[PDB]
Amino acid sequence: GSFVGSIDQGTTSSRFLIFNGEGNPVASHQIEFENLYPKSGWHEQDPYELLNSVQQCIDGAMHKFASLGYSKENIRAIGITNQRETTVVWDSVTGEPLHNAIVWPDTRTSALVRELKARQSADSLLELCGLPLSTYPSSVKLLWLIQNVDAVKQAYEEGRLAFGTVDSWLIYKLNGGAQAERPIHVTDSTNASRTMFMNLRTLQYDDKLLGFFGIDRNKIKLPKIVPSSDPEAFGKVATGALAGVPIAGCLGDQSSALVGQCGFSPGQAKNTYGTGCFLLYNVGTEPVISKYGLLATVAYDFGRGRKPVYALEGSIAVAGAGITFLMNNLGFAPKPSEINALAESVLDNGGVVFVTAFSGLFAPYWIDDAKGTLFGITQHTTKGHIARATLEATCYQTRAILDAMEKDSGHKLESLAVDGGLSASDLCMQTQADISGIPVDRPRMRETTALGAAIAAGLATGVWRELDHVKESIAGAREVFYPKMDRKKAERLFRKWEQAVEMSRGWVRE
Amino acid sequence: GSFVGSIDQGTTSSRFLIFNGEGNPVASHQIEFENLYPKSGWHEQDPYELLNSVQQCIDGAMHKFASLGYSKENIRAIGITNQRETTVVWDSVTGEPLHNAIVWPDTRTSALVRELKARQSADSLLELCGLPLSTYPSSVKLLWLIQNVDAVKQAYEEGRLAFGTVDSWLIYKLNGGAQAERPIHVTDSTNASRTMFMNLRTLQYDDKLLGFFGIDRNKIKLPKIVPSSDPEAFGKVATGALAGVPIAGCLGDQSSALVGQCGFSPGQAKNTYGTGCFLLYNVGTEPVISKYGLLATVAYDFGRGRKPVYALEGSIAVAGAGITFLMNNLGFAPKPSEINALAESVLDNGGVVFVTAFSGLFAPYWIDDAKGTLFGITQHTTKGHIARATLEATCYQTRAILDAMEKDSGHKLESLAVDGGLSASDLCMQTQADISGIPVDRPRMRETTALGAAIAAGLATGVWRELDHVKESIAGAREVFYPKMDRKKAERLFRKWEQAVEMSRGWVRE
């Protein structure tokens, strides 16, 4: 085989891509799928909607792959990357779902979270798994399912409840599920680090963590934790257009994006833009527990003797949602490209600062009583000024998180790569370079997340020997944005932002 | 002979010592000499005040060595240890200095430093020589002397400029200067690793580095880089009371201190206390370039078919200067022992934390916009609480550097030896033991720096055969401080220190 495939199963879409030995994609196919919102704050997906979304993406890509004259016999292996924390529960016996998957943004577990935070044993969870208690981790999601869904209750007590993040589910069913010789139930170190069940330092399940949530190892079937790159642990695709092709790579989507940007050295960071932002910061071979509310997580675990690598993670809630706000809520323009144009139409922000704290501010600010607050409005303020401030808001929060990441880890920021969404805005990336004082790399190959899983698979099957080889091959209409602004003008702009953040505190009273 | 002599030429004093075969001094003589400070931030010494001082200690100590019944015939060899980075320039053909030596803390090179740091070239220096650009290394001091002192630039162009660190200067004159048959112009690997001229991995001058500073090796006379322990490369003392005694050892003072503590295995560290601290960390035969602003230097190069050993170095500005601050600035007490008594008169710090960032904080924090910040004051805070917080402040910063060295090198801390100044405070060292969680070793033999050079000369000439022999022979108030505190209580104290540090950054706005 000479090519590597990659399944990228996201929150709203699935895609399948096939890469060559240099990381460039030759065949691709994407599929939107249905998300379900039974009540406000609830968010679920049919596990079979996710799987068949993937099989229709494989089918579509390989028809295009076939039109170029290639066969499955040429795909050496595939990797999998997936939306993290999304929780699937199925019957160990029949491999059938016992409930809809609860997707990571679901908030039905709020009450449960407040309950678990009132424990005293909760004080020590951050240090053991790298994450604080919240509505996101798979643990609170699965505990809620057991305590509130009877068919899940029975299976747990009867000893036939199987748990998995989306990666585990996909690999299980792709191998054949219950109807299979050598059934495959596993998860890689990056996905398993998002559940709150795993010790971050040992990369093994921890009974202090399991016991805190009342989950019994010897009742529920937990996926076995394996490296993110392995030639055997994930098995092979049993059926379909890819029958007989081995699965050899598996990575959480935000980890896969960092791998796809070749952020393999301490201090190399990546920002993925969608409705919001996910930022990851390579910290090396020793995990770093945050003093600022950042998440400590696994960057990648490629094995073959090498030590696993960790990362710090931060997130912003409002990045592309800011543009959506300007277009729909305020009616500035009907397309995001015309929003950029309005921003480029003015020289600067006109003194406007948009603290886009629609649901408050998160790392590193942790301000829960502020709402969206717009400063600096005069009779001379125009839509372009506000559009600029909306872009800058994302860049200011990005610096705030990267600053925290430098302080948490002690490494100076070495590089910043960007992909997705708002990264297409030259103006926004240029502002990020200006505000942070660092080159901003934006690859032209836009499917960075999927490439990460392809690298993981290629490394397990000999397409690439080491990570130097990965960098060399990948390296081998604009790419890098370089700072233009005086560093003292940059601090001044950033200090105005922080003044506005402090002034936004205390809006919501009770 | 069975005895070994050691020249310890310090920043403000010279001393000559004679050690027996188990590392105990049998004769000593010390002389304070003249430093000079024409302009603020300038620091100079007459190269003959340094050598004359050395000669007077040799004379003074051999007069006492005679009272014991011994003479130069009983001294197998002598070694030399010295203030590092201090730059000496002299004329090749006459052997007379061209200008006063520039002591290492001189700051006249700052402008030139920011000149050379602006070049993209500078990024490659640290990985090349293990050091970043600063005002300390001899490179910028020599370049300044060439670019700004005509007597030196003229000797440079006329091909008779000779450069040397103090070690090289002393060995050259002791051997007889220019009139000597077989003139000796050399420097040991540890001293040469402080100039920024030497490749750290190869222990040879590097044209790439000499080029960066515009230094022509076919025009300037650089000292030959030799091992720290050699029975012939340093020659012999030409005249005086040690006429005929070979010189066979040479180490930078901080490196000599590590040797004198027998810090020979990876992970063994030492700390020397004065106005501040110099910490060294043995990392083994493979050099380690720091991610946290620490310096990569040579620990010792003992030759004899053994690979050289490297180390990581960190420095703290405020250790004894903190005690001095409490006495003079705040008037707590006229003597240091009373400051200590005040700290001992309370059970703990009373919640007080003193971030002693008088001119900011340095490795591994690197905070340039913080001043001294005292936290936790109530109407119950007394001098003793603030005295304790001052001592803990240097221990906290000490732990922060040792943690950074562990992470950089991969080697767990095996031990910590202390010497000088504040190490005499039983309380401070017990506090360090409590905070770091390991035993703290403090030799009753106080002259650890001078022992290092004696060890080098002894290994060169058979007094000690191997490094194991050294450890055994020198294994023969108080000596060892053991942790009297949980890791959990210690971690709480360190977290509040790090919180104080975080709350101190951002004080200076312009």
Numbering used by the authors:
A (entry chain A), B (entry chain B): 65 to 540, 550 to 583
Task: Show sentences the authors wrote.
We initially determined CtGK in an apo form using ethylene glycol as a cryoprotective agent. The asymmetric unit (ASU) contained two polypeptide chains. The physiological dimer is not contained in the ASU but completed by a symmetry-related chain forming a rather elongated assembly (A:B’ and B:A’). A similar organization was observed for the later structure obtained in P2221 (both chains modeled for the range 65–583 with a gap 541–549). The dimer interaction is mostly mediated by β-strands located on the C-terminal domains. Although crystals were grown from the same condition, the collected datasets were processed in different space groups. We observed that in the absence of nucleotide, CtGK adopts open conformation, which upon nucleotide binding closes up.
